[PDB]
Design an enzyme around this catalytic site. Structure first.
Site, short mmCIF file in Angstrom:
data_model
loop_
_atom_site.label_atom_id
_atom_site.label_comp_id
_atom_site.label_asym_id
_atom_site.label_seq_id
_atom_site.Cartn_x
_atom_site.Cartn_y
_atom_site.Cartn_z
CG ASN A 25 41.92 43.75 37.90
OD1 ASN A 25 42.43 43.65 39.01
ND2 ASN A 25 40.78 44.38 37.70
CD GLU A 77 59.34 20.30 35.69
OE1 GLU A 77 60.35 21.01 35.52
OE2 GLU A 77 59.02 19.37 34.92
N1 GTP Z 1 43.33 43.90 42.14
C1 GTP Z 1 42.04 44.14 42.31
N2 GTP Z 1 41.53 44.26 43.58
C2 GTP Z 1 40.22 44.50 43.76
C3 GTP Z 1 39.37 44.63 42.69
N3 GTP Z 1 38.14 44.88 43.14
C4 GTP Z 1 38.18 44.90 44.49
N4 GTP Z 1 39.46 44.68 44.88
C5 GTP Z 1 39.94 44.60 46.25
O1 GTP Z 1 39.13 43.68 46.91
C6 GTP Z 1 38.99 44.02 48.26
C7 GTP Z 1 37.56 43.72 48.71
O2 GTP Z 1 37.34 42.33 48.77
P1 GTP Z 1 36.38 41.61 47.71
O3 GTP Z 1 37.08 40.47 47.02
O4 GTP Z 1 35.88 42.62 46.71
O5 GTP Z 1 35.16 41.08 48.58
P2 GTP Z 1 34.10 40.14 47.85
O6 GTP Z 1 34.68 38.80 47.53
O7 GTP Z 1 33.60 40.82 46.62
O8 GTP Z 1 32.91 39.97 48.90
P3 GTP Z 1 31.48 40.58 48.56
O9 GTP Z 1 31.57 42.05 48.27
O10 GTP Z 1 30.60 40.37 49.76
O11 GTP Z 1 30.93 39.85 47.37
C8 GTP Z 1 39.32 45.48 48.36
O12 GTP Z 1 40.43 45.64 49.21
C9 GTP Z 1 39.73 45.90 46.98
O13 GTP Z 1 40.95 46.61 47.05
C10 GTP Z 1 39.88 44.51 41.41
O14 GTP Z 1 39.13 44.63 40.45
N5 GTP Z 1 41.21 44.26 41.22
#
Ligand code: GTP
Ligand code: GTP
Ligand code: GDP
Ligand code: MG
Ligand code: MG
Lengths: 427, 84, 439, 52, 90, 440
Positions: C228, C254
């Site tokens: 991140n 743009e």
């Molecule tokens: N780049 C990045 N990806 C992340 C991170 N944390 C989780 N992920 C990715 O997020 C995916 C899981 O989806 P999430 O967005 O965590 O699901 P959510 O929105 O938290 O849904 P809930 O857990 O029910 O709250 C996984 O495939 C992880 O690889 C992060 O800090 N950075």
């Protein structure tokens, strides 16, 4: 605020249940009289998920302790952490279940399940927004199985949108501690295939197998076996009480593991179980726990996972580890061992990483497998039981208490139906 | 040393006191709480602060002691923590 | 003038969002508690904060942000972090229970206990501003918090807010390495409702960042903090022509006229050129024509689809630091002479160039270096056809025997919505074939 | 300490002489006499054991 | 010199004979010579093979023999209790 | 401008590159951490270094060389020695498992795993050239990546890089004294590949330098690093007209026009003439007549072949130091008057000279003296055919029984490619026979 109230059913359930409060209260700095003497604020910032609070700086567990005989509840207060339970929640009767499922379901526990459902719902209406329930019991007797089945159908019909857990140390062929042990078990899966969100199945036969082979424990009493279970009751409620770089609550593992609505019997095993001799010669790393989650030796249930097919695998880790290295090692296994894994599900492992480990361990892990090896724990009870219903070996101690002969062929057909839904999806 | 009003979680002895804002009463509990033993090693309310090792090149392929338990760091940083 | 709001949804959205906002306070003079200290010679113009900040009275600056999710455990360490006092408390809106990897429990059950309240905070943020350049959406294609509540939010913003720019940021679910088992089930019900309300839509999959953090950066065993940190530098480059004056600047409105040929093709790819480590990049220089090569390298791209067997539709570069227009137009002459890079037949112009004077700001505790100059790219290539068509199989292994469908169906949706959203994903599979065929 | 801070002399002046060699002689003389005292004490202990 | 460990019950360690019967050489200051009777006494620490054992008591026959030879024994010390086995017993 | 990128392959290729990158750093002013001193100036200024070195913004000089090996423990002294801050890390390319003195374990199986990496790092060294003179290749004909992956290196360098000059220096197997038993299967099968891919190719025998030392530089018991310091005195002297200004220049392209009559004969010889020690250096006056006389001499030649069994086709003298163009010509006219120093009939000119001002550099820890002038030679004699037939015998001794052949056939390789390569070495011995027969 996703709180869960706890139920402990029977002599098997109370000894397993009283150990779970000896380990969770040690996770939260709480002395045997209940008050706080801890070390961090991460202990206290979600302590209201298994606790009420009372005036003066004391917390009481949200547990109701149920029995039919009053003998076991004297043994729980006489235990070292028995002082913390509220005395209003000890609910029990005068006579015994007779080691009968039927005499603890139909006859005796029906006059006492009215009293349980008044102290259960007093906990459930005081909650902020209730999340779940829990139950610990064995599938081999009267108070654990029989009334502990009746209480589930009354929780479910009043709260059918909550989540529900069940724990079970199911009976085994090679060890045998009841002669009517299959009549109790085969009848009692009738309400665990139809009327529960989850149920974990553990085997007392393979509890002894870990304790002699992995831990080199010379004479294991029932104290150390219940310690080995309570680190897995703890392991599923870790993201609910503690932060994480990735999260998995109760509801998340409900959706992801269970593919079809009647296949919810799981296969737990703690990863860094190791002996005192080889604790000093052994390295903890995230590859190395994955080597020990997955082998057929550390499964708590006495089925061989390389005799069927995995459907889904959970792995609820505990510690500061790299999210590549967690995800690297699940790509490792599915592409190395690929016969044992199901063919029409492409990513077969659900993963999760917490932050605050078990105390003392720098790293830890858990495992919740769902395999098609569970049919040899259902089919093997079926021929264990149908030898006895041919000659009507023990029925006059059940038939005389209010039931007829059709209710076993009704619950043997349903027991065979569950076995038939694995050779469908295994092959 | 207080929590901001939208905070969800456990604070001791909120549910008996009355008629005050969340931040004011949280300050009052963290100041005066003689009955409960407040822990010394507390990790929540952080203070706001602003946001050999070179004897081997970044491609060196050999054994470095204690440097397979360290993570999220460069090669030079993991070697720095392993030695120093 | 030129304000723009940024909403972060999901645990992945918040944890990226902590990284973006420790970038933006250090970008400017602002301390963690929000106070800008007096007379300390920072590099902005005068109102260089204003595109991401309000201005309350006594030297206090408040972000233009709102953090939303359904589970409370991941915003509560923002309510007690180092940045606890920076935000106004009535932005960080948390729910009570979580969807737990359902759309149908986020988009259909518990999103309506909370969508009335964020759309009153979205008013009181956009009521204050002069004129919105455009919102920024941060989310991930894994779960149902970050992907199901996101979808209802854009059904409610595309109606109520006209046609302001809505640049979402996604994380496409990595095909090999993955966490959830129902990741393809969520990510094909999403493209039906984000073909209509996102004016631009980016993709970065987690697996490709793991290779770059191994090779170029030399972080063996990365975690989610490092991943991140580099998403923030990409967003920091798309916004650096808002706040700092440029030699040749391009704004938010743009890209949209210039990246996107047809109104159904708005999935670009993002690269950052000297993603490189400080103990090693002491040795090599970084000329303008050197870091233009590293953008077009197959291994440096951020979604695991090879651009060598796809033909480019355009590019959109963004140069920061010490760059001159001579050395940029010299390098573009080199790229168009190589036979490996294919541009599409009906695009003879090719490129789009932005030049700035403000260098990318190093973050202490981070992993990159202090480089004089850097490059982002917003490619638009044909190679995205293979990143749909290898998550459209993992969907169809599982849906052919109706695994897991019995959970979504109970909570407010039917069997046709999985079907309606599958031809809507093989409709877009044809547009990337019919557009890149030559004349 | 005498040898340790005599070795910090600047160039050219750092020369071997009679003082340096006598210092090297007397440090080995002192170590030899210490070893002789160690032997005498270590054998006095065993005659004390005989008297007990 | 031989070193033995009596088998305690629920300890998971491999227990039994620890050093086999052979003459043991001294620590590397004066490395060449081996142990004799005189180096052995009570309330002292004895180093075998990088491991420094602590001696806390004797036998009656050993007391008589060493007092016969001429060494005056120290007062007997004590063995600290094992925390894991104390916790498991209680 | 005037840039040349050196690729060093094998343990013998890396251990040669270390000895001749300690020479280059000392030849210009460059310290072992890249940056020249600021208080003093060892070398007088220009951009002399910009045909071996390369500069970032902050004034740091990093060489344009890539070291490769298929074994990870010869590079790991480069990565930890004094010159570890000088090289950018991805130039030190290393393998995972060795080549085991096979070709088919370094040409077909293991060489395929490291040809992808080296052909993306050398396009990032030939991107930052403006005008690249030509590559340099340093290897030995004994090993498995020093002589098996080097063949697969040059077969792709002749494809994507057109006809930039791929000059190779090499170590030929000595035939009496040779470490490995497996050797003639190596040095037949690699000459057959570097025929059609190399542009120039110098052989030096390890045995033939062992007695150049022990007679001239009176070192009984020479180690390989006494032996490698003489090779750098050759590599620098053929490129000292590129960097350092001269009274009569010669680049790398003007050798090949003036030494190689026909397209298979690109095998010169070498001789560094005042190979002398500092206990005997300041009593002798090393005048140009007596360091051109001592350079044709059959003792001092660096390959184990004698020029008195053939006839010279071309020479290439490389003077360096305090030399005048007249006294060069007064000593060429002495050699030509002899009836024993035989020159071929169809070359009546014979010579190509080059004069450079900058005297050769003395190395700390080295063995030679700081001399005032010095001479090279790249003679192209007919008498190389005797070293083709001594290799041809020892190959054919084994191969009529098929010894060690199961080790190569079992690794992805046709069993009849040992007989393609022996007819490429039986055709080449007649070519040296037929450009020596006289025209009548
Ligand atoms: N780049 C990045 N990806 C992340 C991170 N944390 C989780 N992920 C990715 O997020 C995916 C899981 O989806 P999430 O967005 O965590 O699901 P959510 O929105 O938290 O849904 P809930 O857990 O029910 O709250 C996984 O495939 C992880 O690889 C992060 O800090 N950075
Ligand atoms: N002139 C010279 N020859 C060397 C030197 N070091 C090794 N050799 C020669 O190198 C040949 C052996 O090949 P290697 O040095 O092992 O080269 P390599 O590429 O590592 O071969 P592998 O070990 O199979 O990988 C023998 O002929 C040695 O005489 C050196 O420093 N100088
Ligand atoms: N894990 C565990 N299992 C037990 C313990 N004691 C008994 N059991 C098992 O429980 C079964 C007895 O059934 P149980 O539920 O105790 O009968 P009930 O409680 O009287 O209704 C036996 O098969 C034992 O294997 C114990 O302390 N721990
Ligand atoms: Mg979440
Ligand atoms: Mg070698």
């Amino acid at each position: 605020m996703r709180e869960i109230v706890h139920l402990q059913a029977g002599q098997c359930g109370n000894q397993i249940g009283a150990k779970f409060w000896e380990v969770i209260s040690d996770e939260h700095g709480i002395d045997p009289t209940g008050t706080y003497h801890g070390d961090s604020d991460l202990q206290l910032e979600r302590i209201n998920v298994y606790y009420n609070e009372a005036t003066g700086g004391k917390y009481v567990p949200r547990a109701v302790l149920v029995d039919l005989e009053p003998g076991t509840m004297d043994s729980v207060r006489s235990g070292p952490f028995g002082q913390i339970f509220r005395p209003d929640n000890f609910v029990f009767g005068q006579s015994g279940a007779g080691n009968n499922w039927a005499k603890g379901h139909y006859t005796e526990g029906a006059e006492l399940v009215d009293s349980v459902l008044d102290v259960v719902r007093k906990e459930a209406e005081s909650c902020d927004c209730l999340q779940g329930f829990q139950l610990t019991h064995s599938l081999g007797g009267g108070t654990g199985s029989g009334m502990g089945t009746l209480l589930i159908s009354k929780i479910r019909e009043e709260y059918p949108d909550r989540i529900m857990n069940t724990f079970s140390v199911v009976p085994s062929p090679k060890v045998s501690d009841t002669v009517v042990e299959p009549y109790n078990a085969t009848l009692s899966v009738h309400q665990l295939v139809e009327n529960t969100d989850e149920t974990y199945c553990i085997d007392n036969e393979a509890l002894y197998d870990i304790c002699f082979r992995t831990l080199k424990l010379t004479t294991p009493t029932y104290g150390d076996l219940n310690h080995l279970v309570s680190a897995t009751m703890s392991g599923v409620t870790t993201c609910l009480r503690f932060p994480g770089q990735l999260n998995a609550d109760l509801r998340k593992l409900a959706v992801n593991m269970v593919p079809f609505p009647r296949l919810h019997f799981f296969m737990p095993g703690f990863a860094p179980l190791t002996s005192r001799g080889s604790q000093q010669y052994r390295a903890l790393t995230v590859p190395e726990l994955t080597q020990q989650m997955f082998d057929a030796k550390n499964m708590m249930a006495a089925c061989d996972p390389r005799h069927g097919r995995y459907l889904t695998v959970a792995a609820v880790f505990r510690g500061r580890m790299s999210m590549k290295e967690v995800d690297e090692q699940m790509l490792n296994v599915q592409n190395k061992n690929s016969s044992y894994f199901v063919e029409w599900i492409p990513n077969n492992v659900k993963t999760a990483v917490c932050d605050i480990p078990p105390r003392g361990l720098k790293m830890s892990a858990t495992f919740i497998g769902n395999s098609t090896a569970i049919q040899e724990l259902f089919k093997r009870i079926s021929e264990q039981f149908t030898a006895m219903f041919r000659r009507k070996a023990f029925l006059h101690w059940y038939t005389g208490e209010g039931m007829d002969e059709m209710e076993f062929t009704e619950a043997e057909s349903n027991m065979n139906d569950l076995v038939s839904e694995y050779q469908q999806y295994q092959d | 040393p207080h929590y901001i009003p939208g905070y969800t979680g456990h604070c001791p002895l909120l549910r008996f006191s009355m008629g005050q804002t969340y931040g004011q009463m949280t300050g009052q509990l963290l100041r005066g709480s003689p009955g409960l033993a407040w822990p010394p090693a507390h990790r929540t309310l952080l203070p706001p602060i602003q946001p050999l090792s070179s004897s081997m090149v970044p491609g060196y392929t050999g054994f470095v002691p204690q440097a397979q338990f360290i993570f999220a760091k460069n090669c030079s940083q993991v070697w720095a923590e392993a030695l120093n | 003038m030129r304000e723009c709001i940024s909403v972060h949804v999901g645990q992945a959205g918040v944890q990226i969002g902590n990284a973006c906002w420790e970038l933006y306070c250090l970008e400017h003079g602002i301390q963690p508690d929000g106070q800008m200290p007096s007379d300390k010679t920072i590099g902005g113009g005068d109102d260089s904060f204003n595109t991401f900040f309000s201005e309350t009275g006594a030297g206090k600056h408040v972000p233009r942000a709102v953090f939303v999710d359904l589970e409370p455990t991941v915003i509560d360490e923002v309510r007690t972090g180092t940045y606890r006092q920076l935000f106004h408390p009535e932005q960080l809106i948390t729910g009570k229970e979580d969807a737990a990897n359902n759309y149908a429990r986020g988009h259909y059950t518990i999103g309506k206990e909370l969508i009335d309240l964020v759309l009153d905070r979205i008013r009181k943020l956009a009521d204050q501003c002069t004129g919105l350049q455009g919102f920024l959406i941060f989310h991930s294609f894994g779960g149902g918090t970050g992907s199901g509540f996101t979808s209802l939010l854009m059904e409610r913003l595309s109606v109520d807010y006209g046609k302001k720019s809505k640049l979402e940021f996604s994380i496409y679910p990595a095909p090999q390495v993955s966490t959830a088992v129902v990741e393809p089930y969520n990510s094909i019900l999403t493209t039906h409702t984000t073909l209509e309300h996102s004016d631009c839509a980016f993709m970065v999959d987690n697996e490709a960042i793991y290779d770059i953090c191994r090779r170029n950066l030399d972080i063996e065993r990365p975690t989610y903090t490092n991943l991140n940190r580099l998403i923030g530098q990409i967003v920091s480059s798309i916004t650096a022509s808002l706040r700092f004056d440029g030699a040749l600047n391009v704004d938010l409105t743009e890209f949209q006229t210039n990246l996107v040929p047809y109104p159904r093709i708005h999935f670009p790819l993002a690269t950052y050129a000297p993603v490189i480590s400080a103990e090693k990049a002491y040795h090599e220089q970084l000329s303008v024509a050197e870091i233009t090569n590293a953008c077009f390298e197959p291994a440096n791209q951020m979604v695991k689809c090879d651009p060598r067997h796809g033909k480019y539709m355009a590019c959109c570069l963004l140069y920061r630091g010490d760059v001159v227009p001579k050395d940029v137009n010299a390098a573009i002459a080199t790229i168009k002479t190589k036979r490996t890079i294919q541009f599409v037949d009906w695009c003879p112009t090719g490129f789009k160039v932005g030049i700035n004077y403000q260098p990318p700001t190093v973050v202490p505790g981070g992993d990159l270096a202090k480089v004089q100059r850097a490059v982002c790219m917003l490619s638009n290539t044909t190679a995205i056809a293979e990143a749909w068509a290898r998550l459209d199989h993992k969907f169809d292994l599982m849906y052919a025997k109706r695994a897991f469908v019995h959970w979504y169906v109970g909570e407010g949706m039917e069997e046709g919505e999985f079907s309606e959203a599958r031809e809507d994903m093989a409709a877009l599979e044809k547009d990337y074939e019919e557009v890149g065929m030559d004349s | 300490t005498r040898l340790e801070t005599r070795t910090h002399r600047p160039n050219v002046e750092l020369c071997r002489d009679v003082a340096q060699y006598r210092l090297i002689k007397e440090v080995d003389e002192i170590t030899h006499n210490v070893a002789r005292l160690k032997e005498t004490l270590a054998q006095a202990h065993v005659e004390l054991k005989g008297l007990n | 010199v031989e070193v033995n460990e009596p088998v305690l019950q629920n300890s998971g360690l491999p227990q039994g004979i620890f050093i086999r019967r052979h003459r043991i050489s001294l620590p590397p200051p004066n490395e060449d010579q081996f142990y004799t009777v005189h180096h052995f006494n009570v309330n002292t620490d004895i180093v075998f093979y990088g491991r420094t054992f602590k001696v806390y008591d004797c036998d009656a026959f050993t007391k008589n023999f060493l007092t016969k030879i001429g060494v005056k024994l120290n007062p007997p010390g004590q063995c600290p209790e094992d925390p894991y086995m104390k916790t498991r017993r209680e």
